[PDB]
Write an enzyme that holds these catalytic residues in place. Structure first.
Site, mmCIF file in Angstrom:
data_model
loop_
_atom_site.group_PDB
_atom_site.id
_atom_site.type_symbol
_atom_site.label_atom_id
_atom_site.label_comp_id
_atom_site.label_asym_id
_atom_site.label_seq_id
_atom_site.Cartn_x
_atom_site.Cartn_y
_atom_site.Cartn_z
ATOM 1 N N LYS A 1 0.841 -1.202 0.000
ATOM 2 C CA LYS A 1 0.000 0.000 0.000
ATOM 3 C C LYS A 1 0.879 1.256 0.000
ATOM 4 O O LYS A 1 0.375 2.379 -0.152
ATOM 5 C CB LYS A 1 -0.907 0.017 1.237
ATOM 6 C CG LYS A 1 -1.787 -1.215 1.414
ATOM 7 C CD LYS A 1 -2.768 -1.448 0.278
ATOM 8 C CE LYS A 1 -3.585 -2.706 0.488
ATOM 9 N NZ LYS A 1 -4.566 -2.928 -0.598
ATOM 10 N N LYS B 1 0.585 4.662 -4.727
ATOM 11 C CA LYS B 1 1.214 3.387 -5.093
ATOM 12 C C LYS B 1 1.847 3.499 -6.486
ATOM 13 O O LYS B 1 2.911 2.923 -6.766
ATOM 14 C CB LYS B 1 0.184 2.257 -5.126
ATOM 15 C CG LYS B 1 -0.461 1.949 -3.788
ATOM 16 C CD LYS B 1 -1.738 1.172 -3.935
ATOM 17 C CE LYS B 1 -2.494 1.122 -2.631
ATOM 18 N NZ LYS B 1 -3.936 0.919 -2.851
ATOM 19 N N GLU C 1 -6.994 -2.845 -9.804
ATOM 20 C CA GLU C 1 -8.143 -2.764 -10.721
ATOM 21 C C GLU C 1 -8.830 -1.419 -10.472
ATOM 22 O O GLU C 1 -9.616 -0.966 -11.279
ATOM 23 C CB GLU C 1 -9.188 -3.863 -10.484
ATOM 24 C CG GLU C 1 -8.973 -5.129 -11.310
ATOM 25 C CD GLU C 1 -9.915 -6.272 -10.955
ATOM 26 O OE1 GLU C 1 -10.750 -6.058 -10.056
ATOM 27 O OE2 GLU C 1 -9.823 -7.368 -11.586
#
Ligand code: FMN
Ligand code: FMN
Lengths: 219, 218
Positions: free
Chosen positions: A16, A76, A167
């Site tokens: 993360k 990220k 995603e």
């Protein structure tokens, strides 16, 4: 071996927060590219393309797709060393199958011209089934790309590379940013690679999965 | 890195397994742990795996590879262990709560705010797939394919021969195990073992597009 692979599958986790100062060495970058290029795919269709971003400007382009409701994935992308965007073909036709047949021919896959014709008939069968019988060719090609993502997540772990499959991005914005649709491709999964920062909260949490008794049926 | 690349390069689709060689128990336990630990969007883990190692187990699966798919029969019968990757046929609110409870028992949530947070987040993606994109089953199968990808590499890393199979009658395989009534459907069969000396595809080189064709570096 068995110890190192089970270890790579248990030690990996979805990063993360990446260490923005650490960059992947060329040897690991080249191994990452070889791994995904060599991935298996149904009838060797390889219905993919990969954007690999290592510059700060390149990652910023990709991060345009992680804004608003997807802002939680922005850091990220910006702080990772290399960001791989997995793209899938949006359609497949005879011309692509022949290009593929020729590349296989030049690679010495067939002994005779008859064995070449055989591979083409067999591949055309699976492809036409998905295009016209199941009418899911685009989803089927995306499945081959996800299989590839899988090889990268485990492969990255084995190389001591931190990764996170994503995603949570606006594919329309990302596609437009690289003109993918016009090229016959669409972005489906973004995978930043690098080294996790020590402050990454997800590195200290235990990994949760269904128990073995729940997901397996041994016979 | 060097050995994982050699893994990707040396693996290949086995067209014939040695019926006399079996995987050691240390590698089977590894295979099972590997696929159970696979990642998935929002930790959905929308799958079930059939691991057949007996002649009966394999024969039942082999019923799905007959007629036009008979070319895959020898593969399923001669391998050591055969993994049938199955995907959920649907996903509901009860499955998400179940998943949340398993995560809670495993210690992922420091407080109820984190538990509620994770549920709100996962509900958003799942509801979007079920009702906005209307592609839930395809989305779930893609997580399953991702898992198949970890097994193909993992197997290779353990110097295990493995062939992914799509050429089977899902209706026949599903009916054989009553999968549909249970909310699952077979999508990929992956036999695991050691190739036989009579394997033609084991001697052929591996063909892929070039790097200049598949990459765009920025
Ligand atoms: C297809 C896919 C898409 C994902 N997308 C995201 C994402 O957008 N953001 C994120 O934080 N994590 C994402 N993840 C990470 C998952 O939440 C994670 O894989 C899952 O919780 C299992 O935990 P692990 O990856 O730490 O083993 C994704 C994972 C997969 C497989
Ligand atoms: C999802 C999937 C399904 C496959 N199904 C079959 C199959 O039914 N029969 C078969 O002979 N090969 C099958 N293959 C093997 C492919 O032909 C192979 O992955 C591709 O030709 C690349 O060669 P390699 O696997 O030897 O690297 C499958 C591969 C994938 C990824």
């Amino acid at each position: 071996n068995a110890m190192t692979i089970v270890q790579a599958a248990q030690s990996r986790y979805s990063t993360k927060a990446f260490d923005a100062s650490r960059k992947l060495p060329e040897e690991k970058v080249a191994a990452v590219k070889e791994l995904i290029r060599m991935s298996a795919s149904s009838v060797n269709s390889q219905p993919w393309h990969f954007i690999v971003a290592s510059s700060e400007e390149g990652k910023a382009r990709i991060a345009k797709a992680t804004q608003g409701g997807f802002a939680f994935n922005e850091r990220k992308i910006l702080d990772a060393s290399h960001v791989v965007v997995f793209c899938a073909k949006t359609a497949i036709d005879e011309a692509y199958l022949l290009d593929l047949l020729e590349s296989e021919d030049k690679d010495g896959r067939f002994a005779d011209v008859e064995a070449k014709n055989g591979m083409h008939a067999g591949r055309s069968f699976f492809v036409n089934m998905h295009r016209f019988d199941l009418k899911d060719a685009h989803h089927w090609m995306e499945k081959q790309v996800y299989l590839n993502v899988g090889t990268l997540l485990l492969g990255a772990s084995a190389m001591e590379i931190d990764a996170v499959p994503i995603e949570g991005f606006d594919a329309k914005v990302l596609d437009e940013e690289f003109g993918l649709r016009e090229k016959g491709f669409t972005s489906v999964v973004i995978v930043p690679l690098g080294y996790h920062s020590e402050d990454d909260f997800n590195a200290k949490l235990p990994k949760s999965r269904w128990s073995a008794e729940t997901v397996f049926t041994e016979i």
